[PDB]
């Protein structure tokens, strides 16, 4: 179906109040001091102080 | 699902061609009107 009246700025912006981002699962490698996602192989290829690739 | 326009060249020239229009009197008037309007093609 279609609408009978357009939604105003307040009504539109209220809907997208629950639309945010969060990925703060970072961790610092003990050896290389490289930032990486937790429980993930680091971009260089180290996981808990061990080269794997 | 045959559409209305099935292209051809021999049929196109024998109907809408320069010699087809120039042969009859009405087609010559069409040529004169199309030239007076100043169209670039004049023959389709």
């Amino acid at each position: 179906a279609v609408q009978q009246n357009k939604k105003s700025r307040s009504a539109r912006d209220m809907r997208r109040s629950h639309d945010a981002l969060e990925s703060n699962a970072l961790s610092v490698e003990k050896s290389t001091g490289e930032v990486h996602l937790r429980h993930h192989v680091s971009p260089d290829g180290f996981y808990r102080g061990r080269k794997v690739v | 699902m045959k559409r209305t326009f099935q292209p051809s060249t021999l049929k196109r020239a024998r109907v809408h061609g320069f010699r087809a229009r120039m042969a009859t009197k009405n087609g010559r008037q069409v040529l004169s009107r199309r030239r007076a309007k100043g169209r670039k093609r004049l023959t389709v």
Binding site: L37, H39, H40, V41, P43, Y47, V52, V53 | -
Partner: protein, 118 residues
């Protein structure tokens, strides 16, 4: 409903799902390291481990049974000759899964599957 049902479809039919793991194992037993998707790696550990366990007993029947499900001469040769003797005293746990970032094109959680000793 899925109550205590094991196995994930991966949006593939049964034959594609079977043939995909059959071709993932045969590739894993050539390179010993694969960059694959994490859900595909969580299911690959239920296919390669039975083959590695089967490889610990060399026999005509065992080699034929292995070939029946990982059909490749090179993989059967790699088994029963290098694998199954290296892991002759390791009870289970023949490979590990290490998550590795996300895919570039899509966002698919990737994971490295690696044999435990290499």
């Amino acid at each position: 409903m899925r109550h205590r049902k094991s196995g994930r479809h991966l949006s593939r039919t049964s034959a594609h799902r079977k043939a995909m793991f059959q071709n993932m194992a045969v590739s894993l037993f050539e390179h010993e390291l694969i960059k694959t998707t994490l859900p595909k790696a969580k299911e690959l550990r239920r296919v390669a481990e039975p083959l590695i366990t089967l490889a610990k007993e060399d026999s005509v029947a065992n080699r034929r049974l292995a070939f029946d499900r990982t059909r490749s001469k090179a993989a059967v040769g790699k088994l029963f000759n290098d694998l199954g003797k290296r892991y002759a005293n390791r009870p289970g746990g023949y490979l590990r899964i290490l998550k590795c970032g996300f895919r570039a094109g899509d966002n698919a959680p990737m994971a490295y599957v690696e044999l435990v000793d290499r």
